[PDB]
Amino acid sequence: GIFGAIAGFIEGGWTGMIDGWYGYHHENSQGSGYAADRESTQKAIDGITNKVNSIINKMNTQFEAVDHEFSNLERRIGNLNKRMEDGFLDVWTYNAELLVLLENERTLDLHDANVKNLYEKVKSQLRDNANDLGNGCFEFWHKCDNECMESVKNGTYDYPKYQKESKLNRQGI
Amino acid sequence: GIFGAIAGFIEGGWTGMIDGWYGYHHENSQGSGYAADRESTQKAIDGITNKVNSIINKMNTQFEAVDHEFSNLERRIGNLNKRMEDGFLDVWTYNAELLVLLENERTLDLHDANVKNLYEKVKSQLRDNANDLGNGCFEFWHKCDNECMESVKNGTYDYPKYQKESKLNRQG
Amino acid sequence: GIFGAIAGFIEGGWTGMIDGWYGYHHENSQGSGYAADRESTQKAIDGITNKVNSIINKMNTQFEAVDHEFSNLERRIGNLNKRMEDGFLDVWTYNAELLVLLENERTLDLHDANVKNLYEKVKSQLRDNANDLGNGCFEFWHKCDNECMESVKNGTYDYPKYQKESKLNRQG
Amino acid sequence: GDKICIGYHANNSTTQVDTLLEKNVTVTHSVELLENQKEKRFCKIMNKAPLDLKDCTIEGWILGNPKCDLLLGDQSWSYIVERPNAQNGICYPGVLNELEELKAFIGSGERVERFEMFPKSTWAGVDTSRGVTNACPSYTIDSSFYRNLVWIVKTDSATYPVIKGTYNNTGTQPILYFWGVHHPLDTTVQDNLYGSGDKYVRMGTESMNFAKSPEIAARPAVNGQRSRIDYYWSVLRPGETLNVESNGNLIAPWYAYKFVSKGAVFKSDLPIENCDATCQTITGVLRTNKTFQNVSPLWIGECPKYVKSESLRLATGLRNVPQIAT
Amino acid sequence: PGDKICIGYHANNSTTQVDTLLEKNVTVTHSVELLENQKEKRFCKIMNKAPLDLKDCTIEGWILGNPKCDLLLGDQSWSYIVERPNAQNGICYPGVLNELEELKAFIGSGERVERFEMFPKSTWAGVDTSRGVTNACPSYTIDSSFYRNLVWIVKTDSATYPVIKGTYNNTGTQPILYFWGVHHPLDTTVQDNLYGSGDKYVRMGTESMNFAKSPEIAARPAVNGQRSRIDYYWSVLRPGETLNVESNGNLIAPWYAYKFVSKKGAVFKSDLPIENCDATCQTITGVLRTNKTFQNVSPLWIGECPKYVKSESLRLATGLRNVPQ
Amino acid sequence: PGDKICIGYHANNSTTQVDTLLEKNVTVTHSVELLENQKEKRFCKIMNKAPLDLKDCTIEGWILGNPKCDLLLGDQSWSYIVERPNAQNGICYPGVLNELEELKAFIGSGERVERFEMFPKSTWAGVDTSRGVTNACPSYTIDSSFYRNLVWIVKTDSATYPVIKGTYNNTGTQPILYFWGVHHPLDTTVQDNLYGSGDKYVRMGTESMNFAKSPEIAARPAVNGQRSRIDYYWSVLRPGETLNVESNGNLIAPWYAYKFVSTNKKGAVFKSDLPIENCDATCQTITGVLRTNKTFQNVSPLWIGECPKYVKSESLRLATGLRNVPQIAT
Ligand SMILES: *[C@@H]1O[C@H](CO)[C@@H](O)[C@H](O)[C@H]1NC(C)=O
Ligand SMILES: *[C@@H]1O[C@H](CO)[C@@H](O)[C@H](O)[C@H]1NC(C)=O
Ligand SMILES: *[C@@H]1O[C@H](CO)[C@@H](O)[C@H](O)[C@H]1NC(C)=O
Ligand SMILES: *[C@@H]1O[C@H](CO)[C@@H](O)[C@H](O)[C@H]1NC(C)=O
Ligand SMILES: *[C@@H]1O[C@H](CO)[C@@H](O)[C@H](O)[C@H]1NC(C)=O
Ligand SMILES: *[C@@H]1O[C@H](CO)[C@@H](O)[C@H](O)[C@H]1NC(C)=O
């Protein structure tokens, strides 16, 4: 993946997370679950939808071919019409095919970046209160509440509050 | 934002930073303020300018319609001319409109990338002599003079020089 | 660079690293060397190659001009032919020229990204067992022999294995 | 210890898209933008039926070939369907001049109103009744002629006098009309049919002039005729007037069309059916919301853009990397 | 309490927006509009050269020498032509100017015409040259005149109409645009009165061109009081080419023609004013005075103009997303 | 010292550059040039098939049978046609070859023509077929000749030019391209001399075609010493059709004509003075052969065969590698 998260340092998707594109998986003494991040998911949806609609709108013009006949003394204009029509056809076929290859590449990148940015959003909050396992997972050095998981997700995580417990744990080991 | 900095972990801009695209804001005992990173701001101006001129340059051909007349026995080539002209009009209209949408999306990501790389450039200087908050901001574990700040901006910040002073407070 | 690695926080390339696009330079008591990171360079070669072939394939239709003659009562259709042919010439010239400028920008960015992701990958393995010198260089806080190096390159580095040694040296 | 992980969506989707970098990439959600599907029939467009010329070509309909009487009268069309194998066209051998331009003008139309432009009474001292020919049978009569033309011949005594007619276009609508010049194989047929000496057909309007005289020679037999007819068509603008003057060889305008004026002429075998379409192509109806189609360049109504493309699938979802379950 | 350095980005009072593929109406700090939607509703000089205003005459009226189009008479230089749409004075004696659209096309591609006398009236011997006027072609001062560039030749008061002949050898460097005609009377009475009895012909030829017409007598509907017609013709005598004219009657003879000198030509059919004014890009609907690279005013122009597109705005983001506080 | 591992990238001695939207003259490690700008300034065989070189003759001079063109006289098979810009032998007896652009276009369509006698001189009864030569049309060996494919029929000593008739019937599978003419004398005198007196006509017809023309007698500017002109005409007798020829006088009669093979391949006519050689090509432009794998080309828009897309560009170099930032040595 170009941002390196999707099919990258985060190896796989979650079939379990059915309510979003991007998300959090948590495990705690209370339970374990998959929860989508509403904001990043919705922004991605609004943007991708807009991209599809913009492409559709820019493309809703048509070149119209004609049924006109040409006489045996009209080979040159007849051929002119044919080369003209084929020419526009080739231009538009090219425009759509290339635009689809290009945009598919860029769309997959945009998803990859959104995943990467959520992961970083978490890493900066946790700091050394958690240990980075691979695959985009963090192990807290402290007991983390449901309320605590929510705080990480909604950006409210309190690093000082768990700092002593965490340090004690991190280096008791 | 797509590199996540602009309208992302740095939630807003600075009306106060007047002379650059990409910036530093500082606070210390002496005061507080804004200062552009001239080098990255200029490198972005160069890039964007070159893009704008590349687009202008490539769009610097014209298709010319001619209002030639056609008689009442020339409906076919008359109409051929019309479909032809409107055909190229439709292609160039598409080219310009799509190019503008695409490029606008990408140029915004360029700005985002630049802000993000400036942030990372500072972060990697400061290391553990300072705390990365949420928001592109770093809270020093030491006293940071206007020289100190200027040196952070210059890329000449002295990490050992403050290493012990900051270890202390980071523990204390 | 947009991702900031190439000609960015890593200032220069290596002529020594002959066998790949992206890779490692290592130094240890056993020796010093350059080794390409095979997996990332091969995936980039695949991607760039598909891009080149895609562009070549999409570009594989030709408009055909023709050598037809026109009489002196045929100024309007002769000119129509000329504007038609020139019009397609201008449209294809524009597609190729614009496409090359845009794809060239994007392909450089992709290389920049692969280098930054490689560096980020190692950085995350190493944690605080190593020190960041400048320029994409880590200095280990412990002895790293060739198997240790290989270990980093592979993705299999053992942080617990060296953590006490690197911590003690970090203290010193 | 407690884990928080950051991740992305996966699903059972096996649908793939292509990329400049990569081909056959499975993605969670995607949209196909191109339509490759059609009903193989002709339908109404704007709830207006197409005109089926059936066993008649455009020439056969509009000149009024006698085997085309089903077509005869007023017609309203969303488009014209001309069957490729239609055998009733120009029954009496000859050239319909500016044929392609006529076909284009008829195609620009949506309606024709048939009316008697020059009654047979217009031409005086000449024979109206006689002009018939084995080259133009109806299904009932072996010798007949075009409904829209009169083959005038000299009366039983000599001679063919100068004959004149005028029509003034009082109306709002343009009139599309036809006439001919008869070219006999022989001086014998020429003299038999028409009185002696040089003969002419001359016609005029405010914008137009026409003059021709018979070219007498034997041509290869076509439908039993070594003679030929030169057919002509024109459009009389609203407020314009037509003068016809001749001393011999005139195949006179009789009936003409008030003409009401994008249209198509489809040469096809496809059946017209009791259906509605919003998009109709020469190879069939498109009933789609898609942006692109690969059916046909030639159409009528609102149709998606035509491209040669097999598929145009845009990824909207991310790359699908679901967990392997054994 | 601890000192802080923050990284961030510019913000300004901007309310100017751009669209991207992902988002509409994104306020952006700096931008550049590439499309021009303003024009001066007038015609101006191009390359410091004035346009030719045909005023009340059409192109036909001007080059055939319609008597009411005397203001243009003699030489013309032009950066482009302006034909007023309601122009009244064109072909005054009814009839068809053959290959009209192709003549209109040839003229447009010229810069200049020098009017000269190709065939003096003395060229034709045995015939009257002083009588060929008509009430269909008045000037402003007489009711019966004729095209200045043609002579309507007729029978001298005593029979007959002899074979007339003339030649012009184009010794110059410039092509000659010239005109002639064939008269087609409504009667054999007008035919006999004006020309001889007997079969009339008009034959013309050069090294590369052949022409032969004979009268087609019939009555056509009245236009400008005329049931007769003239078939008018044009052609171009290349440098080094000679024109032989030979006729029996019914020839409307060439009289004055044009040394013709020919970039991009333009015939604007408009009613805008030609003001005292200079320009670099002239559009059929106005002057574009602009540095922008796209325009939405018109596909028809002369000069160096921006490329025409149906868009209403083409604004590139140059700055960044505006998120002020 | 401390143990180092560094992350970095490839560099090399490459001085090759590329452009991007953001930046110009960026030096890169690897790149591909996609445009071709080399040609061989010559004409080669296309589908192992030699083009027709018209040499000193033009297309008219060729298919009318200008007597100075007998080098081209027989059957011809070609992949395209090369016409030298200053070929001197075309229409030698002054006049117009009508619908000429459309003839040049139809000839381009063909890949092969078989010449054959379409109307034997015996066809025309009571008229002289042996006197139709002019000094306007010399062969390289006689100062007075005529087109090898037309008969300038002249009357006999008897004051009458009789009605002459001719039929030909295309029972074969190929269309026949054939020519004829109408003679216009400067004189009523020359008219009388060569043909009858009184109204003259040339009428010809098929199942799908009519033609009638009469003489248009006038003195025109001398060309090849002739103030008289000829109207040449051409047509294509479809398989199964029949040509009927009737004339009163002034007929330049079809004599030899061509069975015409049309072609699946795109066909061309190159006006050019480049040489022709025993070489083979896959792509042939009017200014040269392209021998290339590249996708784009700037040599010409006019070609026959399989050519890269034509563009105005000087160069279309794609970056495949990354920025080249090799170490500075001193
Ligand atoms: C965000 O997290 C904090 C900690 O869980 C919680 O108290 C707060 O209510 C959350 N926001 C809401 C209201 O969802
Ligand atoms: C860079 O920072 C130092 C303080 O570390 C300052 O004295 C110096 O003038 C600065 N250089 C520039 C170019 O501003
Ligand atoms: C915004 O700034 C520009 C220049 O500072 C100024 O001209 C304009 O008046 C300002 N906008 C407002 C609030 O009027
Ligand atoms: C025309 O004039 C030139 C010299 O002025 C002369 O050489 C040429 O023969 C003339 N052409 C004819 C046919 O009169
Ligand atoms: C590119 O740069 C070189 C110098 O580095 C210069 O000679 C050339 O003109 C520039 N041209 C193009 C084609 O961009
Ligand atoms: C031409 O030849 C065919 C084959 O014999 C014959 O059937 C046809 O009658 C001929 N054409 C005419 C009309 O004689």
SS3 state of residue E49: strand
Beta-sheet strands, E only, within chain A: 22-28, 31-36, 130-132, 137-140
Are the beta carbons of D140 and D60 closer than 8 angstroms? Answer: no
Q: Whole-angstrom Cα distance, residue C103 to residue A86?
A: 27
Q: For chain B, what is the largest distance between any 2 Cα atoms, rounded to a whole number of angstroms?
A: 97
Give buried/exposed letters for F281-317 (b at 16+ CB in 10 A, else e): bebbbbebbbebebbbbbbbbbbbbebbbbbebeebb
Question: Rounded to an integer, what is the distance from CA E154 to the centroid of its chain?
Answer: 31
Domain with residue A85: its CATH number is 3.90.20.10
Q: Which of B144, B131, B122 has the alpha carbon at shortest distance from E7? A: B122
Cis peptide, bond prior to residue E188, ω within 30 of zero: no
D262 burial level (CB within 10 Å; 0-12, 13-18, 19+): exposed
Q: Which of D232, D236, D241 has the alpha carbon at shortest distance from D101? A: D232
SS3 state of residue E238: coil
Domain locations in chain E?
Answer: 1-43+276-325, 44-275
Task: Give the pairing type, strands D265-267 and D163-168.
Answer: unpaired
Are the beta carbons of F66 and F137 closer than 8 angstroms? Answer: yes
Q: Is F11 on the interface with C (CB under 8 A)?
A: yes
- Supply the Cα-derived Rg of chain C in whole angstroms: 27
Q: Which of E9, E299, E320 sits opposite B85 (nearest CB)?
A: E299
HEC string of C54-117 equals HHHHHCCCCCCCCCCCCCCCCHHHHHHHHHHHHHHHHHHHHHHHHHHHHHHHHHHHHHHHHHHH
- Which residues, including other chains, have CB under 8 Å from residue D96's CB and lie 6 or more apart? D59, D63, D90, D102, D231, D232, D233
Q: Whole-angstrom Cα distance, residue E271 to residue E82?
A: 8
Fold classification of F1-43+278-330 (topology level)? Hemagglutinin; Chain A, domain 2 (2.10.77)
Q: How many CB pairs under 8 A join A and C?
A: 50
User: How open is the CA angle C7-C8-C14, to the nearest 5 degrees?
Assistant: 45
Tell which one of F17, F19, F24, F25 to mutate to probe ligand 5, the residue whose CB is within 8 A of the most ligand atoms: F25
Single-letter amino acid, residue A65: A
Of the residues B70, B71, B72, B74, the best mutation for testing chain D's interface (the one with the most D CB atoms within 10 Å of its CB) is B72
Selected from 3.40.50.1820, 1.10.579.10, 2.10.77.10, 3.40.50.300, the CATH number assigned to the domain covering E1-43+276-325 reads: 2.10.77.10
Structurally, what CATH architecture does the domain formed by D43-273 represent? Answer: Alpha-Beta Complex (3.90)
Q: Whole-angstrom Cα distance, residue A149 to residue A139?
A: 12
Q: Whole-angstrom Cα distance, residue E262 to residue E107?
A: 9
Single-letter amino acid, residue E263: K
Q: Whole-angstrom Cα distance, residue E230 to residue E182?
A: 6
Are the beta carbons of E303 and E294 closer than 8 angstroms? Answer: no
SS3 state of residue D220: coil
E269 burial level (CB within 10 Å; 0-12, 13-18, 19+): middle
Q: Whole-angstrom Cα distance, residue E22 to residue E20?
A: 5
Beta-sheet strands, E only, within E80-227: 81-83, 95-97, 112-117, 127-128, 150-152, 154-155, 164-169, 176-184, 202-205, 210-213
SS3 state of residue C149: helix
Q: Is the CB of A103 under 6 A from ligand 1?
A: no
Find the Cα–Cα–Cα–Cα dihedral C77, C78, C83, C84, rounded to 10°. Answer: 70
E173 burial level (CB within 10 Å; 0-12, 13-18, 19+): exposed
**Distances in Å between the alpha carbon of F63 and those of B86, B121, E19, E279, F53?**
41, 79, 63, 54, 13
A113 DSSP 8-state letter: H
The C-alpha of C152 sits at a distance from chain B's nearest C-alpha, in angstroms, of 21
CA F238 to ligand 6 center in whole angstroms: 13
**CATH class for domain E44-275?**
alpha beta
The C-alpha of B90 sits at a distance from chain E's nearest C-alpha, in angstroms, of 8
Q: Which of C17, C41, C29 has the alpha carbon at shortest distance from C149? A: C29
Are the beta carbons of E6 and B130 closer than 8 angstroms? Answer: no
Q: Which of E57, E43, E85, E38 has the alpha carbon at shortest distance from E302? A: E43
Q: B97 is in which domain, residue-wise?
A: 1-172
The C-alpha of E20 sits at a distance from chain A's nearest C-alpha, in angstroms, of 8
Backbone angles phi, psi at F103, to 5 degrees: -75, -50
Q: Whole-angstrom Cα distance, residue D145 to residue E213?
A: 34
Q: Whole-angstrom Cα distance, residue D108 to residue A167?
A: 85
Residues 70-89 of B with CB under 8 A from C: 70, 77, 80-81, 84, 88
Q: Whole-angstrom Cα distance, residue E54 to residue E51?
A: 9
What total number of domains does chain C contain? 1
E321 DSSP 8-state letter: B
E48 DSSP 8-state letter: T
B164 burial level (CB within 10 Å; 0-12, 13-18, 19+): exposed
Are the beta carbons of F143 and F135 closer than 8 angstroms? Answer: yes
Instruction: Judge: domain D1-42+274-326, CATH 2.10.77.10.
Output: yes
* Ligand 2 atom with minimal separation from the B156 CA: 5
Are the beta carbons of D67 and D137 closer than 8 angstroms? Answer: yes
- Residue B71 has, within 13 A of its CA and on its CB side, a CA count of 17
Q: What is the DSSP string of F189-257?
A: HHHHHHS-SS---EEEE-SS-EEEE---------BTTBS-EEEEEEEEE-TT-EEEEEESS-EEEE-EE
Structure tokens at E324: 């002020």
Q: What is the DSSP string of chain B?
A: --SSTBTTTB---BTT--S-SEEEEEEETTEEEEEE-HHHHHHHHHHHHHHHHHHHHHT------------TT-HHHHHHHHHHHHHHHHHHHHHHHHHHHHHHHHHHHHHHHHHHHHHHHHHHHHGGGEEE-SSSEEEESS---HHHHHHHHHT---HHHHHHHHHHHHH-
Q: Which ligand is nearest to the CA of B125?
A: 2
- Supply the Cα-derived Rg of chain E in whole angstroms: 29
Q: Do the chains contact at C79 and B66, CB–CB below 8 Å? A: yes
Q: Which residue of E has its CA nearest to D203?
A: E220
CA E6 to ligand 1 center in whole angstroms: 27
Residue with the two structure tokens 């990697």: B124
Give buried/exposed letters for B8-45 (b at 16+ CB in 10 A, else e): bbbeebbeebeebbbbbbbbbeeeeebbbbeebbebbe
Are the beta carbons of D21 and A39 closer than 8 angstroms? Answer: no
Structure tokens at E178: 């010239």
Q: Which of E6, E294, E307 sits opposite B25 (nearest CB)?
A: E6
Are the beta carbons of D305 and A95 closer than 8 angstroms? Answer: no
Single-letter amino acid, residue D46: M
Q: Which of B137, A149, B151, A147 has the alpha carbon at shortest distance from A139? A: A149
Kindly report the number of other CB atoms within 10 A of residue A46's CB atom: 12
After which residues does chain D break, using C–N > 2.5 Å?
261
Selected from 3.40.50.720, 3.90.209.20, 3.40.50.2300, 3.40.47.10, the CATH number assigned to the domain covering F44-277 reads: 3.90.209.20
- Supply the Cα-derived Rg of chain B in whole angstroms: 27
Q: Which of F78, F14, F20 has the alpha carbon at shortest distance from F51? A: F78
Alpha helices in chain F (DSSP H): 59-64, 100-109, 188-194
